[PDB]
Structure formats: structure tokens, C-alpha cells
Symmetry: C6
Subunit: 216 residues, 6 copies
Amino acid sequence: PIVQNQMVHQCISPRTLNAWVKVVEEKAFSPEVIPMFSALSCGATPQDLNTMLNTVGGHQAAMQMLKETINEEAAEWDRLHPVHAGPIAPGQMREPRGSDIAGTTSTLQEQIGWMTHNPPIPVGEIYKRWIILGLNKIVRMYSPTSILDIRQGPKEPFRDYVDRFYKTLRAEQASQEVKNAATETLLVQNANPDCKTILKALGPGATLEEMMTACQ
Amino acid sequence: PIVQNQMVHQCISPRTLNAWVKVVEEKAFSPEVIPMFSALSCGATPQDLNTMLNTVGGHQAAMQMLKETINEEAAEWDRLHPVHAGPIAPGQMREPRGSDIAGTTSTLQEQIGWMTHNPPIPVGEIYKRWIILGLNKIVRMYSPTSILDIRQGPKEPFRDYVDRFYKTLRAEQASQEVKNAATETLLVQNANPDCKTILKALGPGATLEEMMTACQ
Amino acid sequence: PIVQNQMVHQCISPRTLNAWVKVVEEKAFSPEVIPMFSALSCGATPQDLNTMLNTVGGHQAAMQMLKETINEEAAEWDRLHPVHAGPIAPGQMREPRGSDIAGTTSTLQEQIGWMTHNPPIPVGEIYKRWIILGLNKIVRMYSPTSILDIRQGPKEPFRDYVDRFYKTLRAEQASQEVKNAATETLLVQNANPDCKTILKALGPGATLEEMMTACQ
Amino acid sequence: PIVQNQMVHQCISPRTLNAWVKVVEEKAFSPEVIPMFSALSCGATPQDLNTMLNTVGGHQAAMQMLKETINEEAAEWDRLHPVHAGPIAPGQMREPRGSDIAGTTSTLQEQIGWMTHNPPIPVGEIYKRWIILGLNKIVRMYSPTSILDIRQGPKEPFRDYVDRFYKTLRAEQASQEVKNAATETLLVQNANPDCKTILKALGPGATLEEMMTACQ
Amino acid sequence: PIVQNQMVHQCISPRTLNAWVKVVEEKAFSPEVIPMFSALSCGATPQDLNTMLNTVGGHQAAMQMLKETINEEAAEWDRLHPVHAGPIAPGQMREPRGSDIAGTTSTLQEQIGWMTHNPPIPVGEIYKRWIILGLNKIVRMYSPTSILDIRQGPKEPFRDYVDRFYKTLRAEQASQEVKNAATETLLVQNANPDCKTILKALGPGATLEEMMTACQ
Amino acid sequence: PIVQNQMVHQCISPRTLNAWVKVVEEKAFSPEVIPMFSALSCGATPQDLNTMLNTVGGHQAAMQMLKETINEEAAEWDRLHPVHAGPIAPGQMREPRGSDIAGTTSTLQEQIGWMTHNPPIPVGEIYKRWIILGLNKIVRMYSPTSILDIRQGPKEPFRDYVDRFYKTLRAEQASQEVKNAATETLLVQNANPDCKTILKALGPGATLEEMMTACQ
Ligand SMILES: CCOC(=O)CN1CC(=O)Nc2ccccc21
Ligand SMILES: CCOC(=O)CN1CC(=O)Nc2ccccc21
Ligand SMILES: CCOC(=O)CN1CC(=O)Nc2ccccc21
Ligand SMILES: CCOC(=O)CN1CC(=O)Nc2ccccc21
Ligand SMILES: CCOC(=O)CN1CC(=O)Nc2ccccc21
Ligand SMILES: CCOC(=O)CN1CC(=O)Nc2ccccc21
């Protein structure tokens, strides 16, 4: 990444290379892989981000959809920040284009220069915006199950049911407002009759905690 | 987190990301996960705390009750510390609101600035107060068993019994004063007749050690 | 803990949090857990010591006897070092009471200030004296077996027998003088007749090595 | 490698020695081993690169093809950058030849001097260009399967099929332009009739995501 | 231990605490545990050395023979370096006695002061001389087998035989001169007739390599 | 080893002690253990090198042949660099003899002084030349199989065959010139008739890659 003593380039740690590859091996594209990708790529250059992306042996369909999202993001970047053509002023910083931010056309030096400049041209954090927006499209994609098919078994503890509902809501990339709101509607509707009957009795303004105790 | 050389932002370590995720995988919401959460989040920014929270794939019902506790804590914060509306003085620190402390509306820079200021605006330690108060509500919730149903088997060693009692008392979030006091009452009542008879003989002012030897 | 560059507060390492929790999981309250507790808590604040104590999910009976030992040690502390009541001089160090040393009433800052002062008020090392004196009471308690019931099988190698004897002597918290002395008496008496006969032949002034060769 | 405090030689870490040897043991010459080799050899001297190469017990046929690629690259280097023969000016840097860049004729000191010079003679990064160009020839070689034999089973989920296609395309070292393009042609042709029929309906200008949803 | 930035006290690492305890668990008192003990106790204080010794749950007979060796070494120390009795000059370094070097009567501060002084009073390295001389007495003790009972099976490869011979010679603590010499005598005598006959043919001045090839 | 901040002695890491002992446990004297020994002993003193050597419990026949190689290398050293006899000039560096380089007669201080001097007397790198030349003699020794007995099975993939050939060539310590050359002769001769026939067709000037594709 880029880190502090001044701001200096550091080699991506075997610890970190490993941790990303194991997390993709174990959790595939489970929602919780995104906040963890972000965490393992703290202070990462575009070369670091390609390195983590490029170390994944499997999921080559997911990786390809990702190149697509990144071409589009690189394209939009070039539409909003066109770069001067012809020779760069000797010994001076040239502006980054989309493929420079993605790390396919920039060098580590170039990338270093952009991120360590005052004020910084933050190509690490910009590309990781691109990659993560792409990584979420893959999560919703690989979301196996609809929130409509998440219903409570007759003998299933309410707590186990709510875990599947919200795990599903999370993979289905539902906005926080539908997550705050999901409680008073589908969570109740989708509950079994014994529980459903308890929850209806509470009425509106019941919390998840109040809901989850009522049916424990 | 934020650490010392001056006070400087450091990348949350793969060691730490892993240790929190394994501890939730293994112990779920066993009481002892709280002091360990706190320990793994030493010097943590709100972004670090969201990162650890967001890396948990399971327990999405628990996570949702937690958003609730945090909205309430963010709300109370705004009720006591309202923030000036309109443009911030150029190049100056704006006050944090509830959602700034929770890390949903602040940036790492903003969060850095608050915690590294003299004297510090300690948003790491404030949000971790919020998260932990929420994490305890989940522990009592997921406390399977009442202290009334913790009784000593006829053939069960007193020591094994006291382990379940106090493990239970801990998950049931009983105050230290009921823990000091629990000895002279329920611990004896809930003991088996052979042991109960020994303990009654000791009378009052007997320690747990004296109690636990008497019945070994 | 508190460590050196000046003397500075450092975050308890995931390595260390883990190592203590694994050592309690594996060895429970085997004597050798004490010197290891001490080692893992090198330079530890009272908050670090509570953190290691509080991370133990099991042994809640042992933990409760420990609160007892610590209340008594905190009480004795207050009996010998009473603290001035009323407002602390602005910007000045207030004296620590028993519950300040135990970390239930002090803050990390307060604790930092005490230990980093010239000369230091060493609350880390004082509380760890308290905790360890309590942890030994638990070892003797959870000592399953008397040195009188450690006797050599007819077919058991003398070396295997002496391992059980001294392992037992150690859990039974016998003073070093009874350990130096245990050789010329019970070790011989408790040995089997074939070995006993050899050892008696040596007479007094025989070492453990001479004893252990004689019977190999 | 060579790292920063100035730029200083550091011992290749047991962590790194291990991580390369495990990655060759587990993944052999799967494409994703290349970006990972590169990552584990960050700031590496030619001696570091030989060290990682030389620690591989297996794949001695692959290693031998690699000596070949490196002799050719060393040869081309000498064809373009011939070195002055006879005595080097006392206390001065001599130019590197091909076998100096490969690390068979240079010393660590010599290699250090080249890479730490202003501006640097970057023999670490030059040899790793050589090694990696050789390592890709081995990947295409050890590519078991043609993209023509990657066809979708009647009962095989489209997503599983696209994973094999692009994993294959990657081992077969197809250029990014054939990867962008592979979608509108062979991916469809090679799909099963039920899916093929859906994809044909979309027509041209369909993305992989649109393709992959259409057939989910 | 004591390490450098000046010379400073460092906390014994969980890595090191663990590595010693695992090595005693796995290899017991196999000769090769000594050079490894020494290595794990690099820069160690007497408190560090007691800590590593005290963390061993098993082998309490071995540990007790070790207290004996250390009392004798502490005694000899006091016989050669008697210490002035009565009050130490205020703020000045008092001389170390045997039990001060063993760490039973010294403090970490006292021990720090001795080892960090110019020139150093090297109590770490002196006690580790004591402990290691004691640890070797335990190795010869726990040497199961005589070099006279190490003989080559009729069907046993000479190389396998020489491994047992020299492993035995090592546990039996034979001096290097008997190891240089052991070849021309017992190694041949103890070999089987087919091999013995080959080795006799070589005559004197044959190396182990020449011996070991002759019989491969 | 000896490392940089100046050049300073550092304690051999538990990581490194472990990594060498595991690599001998797993790979015994497979050729690839040599480049790995070298790597784990980066900046190592003679005491570090003895420490790694001395931590190996097994292979005592190999270790003994190694003492032999080192006595010979120490002897040759003394034949070429005889040392002045009688008292060393007070406070001055005495010259190293063979047994000083091997670390049997030198001290860590003495060894430190030699390696940290300007210009350095490089006893770490000299002894590791000795040890490695000895370690290769052991590899050829423990080479089970001749390159003449490495022949391709009728049904064995050419690639699998070439792996055994070159793995064998490597253990048999054949010079690089016989490795470059081994292709046009024995590799073909030793191949099976179906493959042999293909390879003969190529004629001379065929690469291993061309050879290995021809027969895939
Ligand atoms: C504008 C083009 O940008 C890219 O293709 C970025 N990229 C580079 C890479 O090396 N690997 C990679 C892997 C998956 C997704 C995108 C990448
Ligand atoms: C006022 C709103 O605050 C939050 O929702 C805080 N938060 C942010 C997050 O990223 N994850 C998260 C996970 C569980 C619980 C709370 C969070
Ligand atoms: C005077 C009161 O002191 C304490 O109770 C100390 N203490 C604090 C804690 O957090 N945990 C703990 C766990 C076991 C034993 C004592 C503690
Ligand atoms: C011009 C000659 O260069 C080399 O042979 C480079 N080389 C050196 C080495 O030590 N090992 C190695 C292992 C595989 C491939 C090339 C090497
Ligand atoms: C002169 C007395 O010295 C000692 O007993 C040294 N000692 C101290 C200790 O804490 N543990 C220990 C464990 C095994 C062997 C010796 C020790
Ligand atoms: C001239 C004598 O040198 C040596 O014997 C070097 N030596 C020292 C050692 O401690 N162990 C060792 C283990 C295997 C091989 C050589 C050693």
C-alpha cells in the first residue's frame, strides 16, 4: 500500500495476500466479503488492488463482469476528466485517465506520485470505489434466494428465521430504508401463524428486539 | 486504528480482522465476546468499528437489533449536542452528529481529525460505548437459560454446577451486586440436598471458596 | 500494555489475547498457567489484566472466587493507603484506591498516568500481584489429588512416578522447602518395594539424580 | 528485498519463503500463481528471485524451460547492451550483463549497488520481467484444455460454465481483446440449447451480466 | 529479553513462550531441545529464563533435578564471589549472589541494571550456562539406550543405522573426540557382517562418507 | 543474524528456528533444502548457523559427515591464513582461524566484531560456504536413483517423466552444462518409443518446450 513513517510505498504483506485469497475461497461472494476486501486493501495502490483481484484463481465469470464494470467506470471518468494529449512537461506529473486509475496503463511510480502529492490525486480510493460498486453487482447476482421465499418453518425458532431474512436482504442489496421498514411488513407476513399471531398483537411501533422476544 | 509514533492512523491488521471474525464464528454472542470485541477494537476509528461489524456474515438479526440501538444512541446524541447548520468555516473542524460518530456520514479524515485534535473529540470510544451497550442487549436476549433452571444434578460435582450458574448469571447480565449476593441465596437453594445440607451448616459469612471446599 | 520507544501505551496484541484464551482452554488451572499468565501480561495496565480475565468464557466459579480475592486485596490496600476525599487539585494526579488498582473505578488515562509517572505508581504490577495470589488459591482448590495418594505402581517406571509426585506437589502449592525435603521422606515411602529397597540402600544425602538412576 | 527506512537490503522473510512454496504446492502453474509470484517478490533482488525459484522441489521440467527463457532474455540483453571488457575503474559500478541481471554472475553487493543507485539500474524488476514472461509460457503449456472443449452441460448452471470458460481462457493466455470479444461468439455457441436460445434472443450489445441473468 | 534500539528490556513474545512449550511437548528431552532452548532465550533475563522453565506443565522430576543443579551452581558462585553484607550505598548497584543470578532473589530492575551496565554483569548468560549444564545431565539420564545396544539389523540400510548410532551418541553426551573416533571402532564392530566385511576392506583413514558409500 | 537500523546483532526469530526444523522434517535432504537453508540464514553469525544445524534432532549421520567437511574446510583455512600466536594487542581484534569461522572457538562478540568491522571479515558468509558445500555432498549421497534408471513408462505423460529426470539430475548434482545438454541425449534415449519417435523427428536445435509440446 502507501503508509506513513512522510508517506511511503510498502510491499503488500504475505499475511494480506493470503487473507484475501482464503476469504474468497471460503465465503465466495457472500455480502460480508466486500467490507473485508475494503479492509485488506487499506492504503492500496491500483497495482495492490489488481494484485488482490489477480490472485483469485476461481470466479472468472465474476472477474469478467468486473472488468466490464471497470471499463464503464474508466469510460465515465474520461467523459468527465479528459486529459491533455501530446508530450508531458519534463519532470512533471501527467493527469490520470480511467485506465491509469484502474492500473492497466499507469506505473507504480506514477500511481505513487498521484497518491503522495499535496493535495493527493487519490487513485487507490477511486479505483476501490469502482471495484466495490462492481463487487456488489456480483453479490445481488449470486444472491440465490428472494426475500419472498424467506418464510419461517412451523418448528423454526424466530431468531433462526430473522437471520436468513436479513442475510438474504443483505445479499439482495436492499437499501437501509427497506431494512428499517422490512420489519413492520414482510418479516411478520413471512412468519409462521403462531408467531405471526403474537407479532400482530404487538401492533405498530414494536422494535425487532420487542418482536424477537414476543416470539422466542 | 489511531496509534502513536504523534498520533497517526494505522490500517486494521489482517491479524485483527481475522481474530474478530473467528471469535464470532466460534463463540457467537457468549458474554466473553464483548471484552474481546473491545480489545480487538483498541484505538479503532468509527470506520474500523463498522469494518469489524460489517465483516460478520452471520447473525444478521443481531446486527439489525444493533443498527436499532445505534439509531437510538445517535438520536440521543443529537438531542444533547445539536450541530450548527449551514457552511462550515473554511479549513475548520465541523462538530460531529450521531451518524458522524456511527461512521455512516463522517469520512476517515473527518474521524481522524476529531480523535487526533487537542483535546480529542473521542468518536472511536463514543461509538464503541454505543456498539457495546447494544451488544449486551443481544447477550441477555441470546441467554438461553434462566438462573432458576440452573440447579445441581444429584451426581454433578458442585464446581461444575457453579460454573453453569455464574456463566448463566453472566449471559443473563445480572449486576455485580446480585453476583456478590447470589451466593448466600439461590446458589445454595439450587444445590442438591447432600451439598445443600453441608452449605446450610456453614451459615452466613461463608465465602465461595469455603462453600466450594465444603461440597468438593 | 505500557512499553518503550519514552514509556507509551500499546494495544494488547491479537496474538496475546488469543494465547491466554487458548492456554485457559487447554490447561484450565494447571499450575504452569500462572507463570504463563504473568508472561502474557508483561507491561499490562489494569484494563489489559481485566481484558485477559474477561475474555475467559468458562471457569466462572474460578472467576468469582477471584473477584473475592481481589475485593479483599482492594480492601487491605484501602486500609493501608487511605485516599484524600473531595476535589482533586486541577490538572493533578489523584491517589489510587483498591478499585482503581483493580481497574473497576480508574480510566486507561488515569492508569497510564500512575504507571508512566516518575517514580511510577505501579498499578499494573500491584493488581497482577493480587490476581496471581488469587489464581494460586484456585490451583490448590482444583488440585484433584493428595501427595499421599501419589504412590508408584508395581510396574511403573520410577521417572513416571516422580513426574506425578512433583506435578502434584506443584498443584498442591507445597513450599520449595517441602520440595527440597519431599525427596528423603514421602518420595521413598510412596515408591514400590523393589525401588524402595534400592533407595533405602543409598541412605541420606542422595540426590534426586542419584535416587532416579538407582531405580531406573 | 530492497526496502526503505534511505533504500536498504532486507532478508527475505520466512513468511514469504513459505508462502511461495505453499502456493506452488497447492496451485502448481494455475494462471493466478503469476500475479502472486510478482506480489511475494516485491522489492526482490535477483538473489531473492533465484531463492524463490530454487526453493521449489517439484516442477523441474518447468524450471528447466525457465532457464531456457532466461538464457534467451539474457542473450537479447547482451545483444542490446554490450558491456566494456577489461578492468573496472577502481571503486566504481561496472555495467550489468544478462547473467548479472539473472543473478548467476552478479553478487548481492553488486545487485544492491545497481538497484540503490541514482537513478536506479533496476535489475530486480528486469529479471522479474524475464522470469514472468517465462512463467506464462509454462501456464499455456500446462493449460490442459482448449476453449473449444469448454461447452455447457445440459444440466449445468450457466454461471458454473462461464467460470470454466474464462478460467480456461486465462490459462490459454488469450489477449484481453479476445476476452472482451469471446462473449458475443464462442460463449454463446458453446452454451446448451435452452440457454443458447435465450442468449440469441438478446441479440448483440448484451453484457455478460445481462447474458448471465438471462440464463440463470 | 534485553535488546537494542541503547539496550532496553523487551516483553518475551507470545511467539517465543509458545515455541518453547511446544518444543518440550513434542521432543521432551531429546538432545536437540538444548540448542533450541538457548536460541529461544536469546537476550533473556533470569526472569525470562524462569518464565520459560516455569511454563512447562510436565517433566516435574526433570525440573526438580534442575533446581538441584542450580542450587549447586548458585552455591559455587557464592563460594567464589562472596557479597558485602549490610546496607547498599544509596542509589548504587549491589553485587549479585547465586540466587540473584537464578532470579529467585533479584528483581527485573536489578537484573536489568546488571546486564545493561558498562561493562555488563551478564546474569542472563551466566544463569543460562547453569540451566543448560543441568539440562544436559537430564538428556544423558533420559538417554534410553547404550551405544553398545545400537547394532545394525541384517536388512537395515547402513544410513538408517548410522542415524541411530549418532542420535544415541548425542543423547549419551559423548565428547566430540569419541564422535570423531567412534567411526574406526564401534560403528564398524556394531555393523552387520555384509557391511562389516566391506568396511574392514577399506582399512584405516576411511571417512564416514567413504564408509557410508562403501555400504550403501 | 546481523542486520541494519548501523549494523546490529538481532536474535534468530522463533519463526526462523521453526521454518528450518520443519523444512528438514518434511523434505529431509531434497536438493531444494539448500537454497532454503541459505535463505533462512540471511545475515547469520556462525552461532546462528550452529543453532540451525544443532536444532535438527534427526539425520545425525548427515550431521557427522558435515562436521567432517567443516574440519577439512577449517583445516584448509588455517593452511592459507595462519594466525599470530601469543597475546592479542589489548582492546584489538584478533584474526579468525578455521574453528573461529565454524563458531566452536569464537564468541558472539568476537563473531560480531569480525562481521561489523570496516571492511568486514565475513565469517557468517564464509562458514555458510563451508556448510553448503558439505550439505550438497549429502544431497548426491542421499540421491536414491541414477539418471540411467529415470526412463518414461509406456503410459506416463512426457511432462511427468521430465519432472523425475530433472529432479534426479538436481539431486545427482549434475553441472548446469550437463543440464543444458541432457536434453539432446539421455532425455530422448530414456523416453518411450511413441515419444522417442516424435522427438527424433524434430532433430537437433529443438528446445525443451518444443520437445515437451511435440510429446504432449
Ligand atoms: C480499464 C481496464 O481496467 C482493468 O481491467 C482493471 N483490472 C486490471 C487487472 O490487472 N486485473 C483486473 C481483474 C479484474 C478486474 C479488473 C482488473
Ligand atoms: C446511525 C446509523 O449508524 C449505523 O448504522 C452504524 N453502522 C454502520 C455500518 O456500516 N455497519 C453497521 C453494522 C451494524 C450496526 C451498525 C452499523
Ligand atoms: C475491587 C473489584 O475488582 C474487580 O472486580 C476486578 N475485576 C474487574 C473485571 O473487569 N473483571 C474481573 C474478572 C475477574 C476478577 C476480577 C475482575
Ligand atoms: C542466464 C542464466 O540465468 C539463470 O539460470 C537464472 N537462474 C539462477 C538460479 O539460481 N536458479 C534458477 C532457477 C530457474 C530458472 C533460472 C534460474
Ligand atoms: C537457587 C535457586 O534457583 C532456582 O530455583 C531457579 N528457578 C527459579 C524458578 O522460578 N523456576 C525454576 C524452575 C526450574 C529450575 C529452577 C528454577
Ligand atoms: C571445526 C569444527 O567445526 C564444527 O564442528 C562446527 N559445528 C559446530 C556446532 O555447534 N554444530 C555443528 C553441527 C554440524 C556440523 C558442524 C557443527
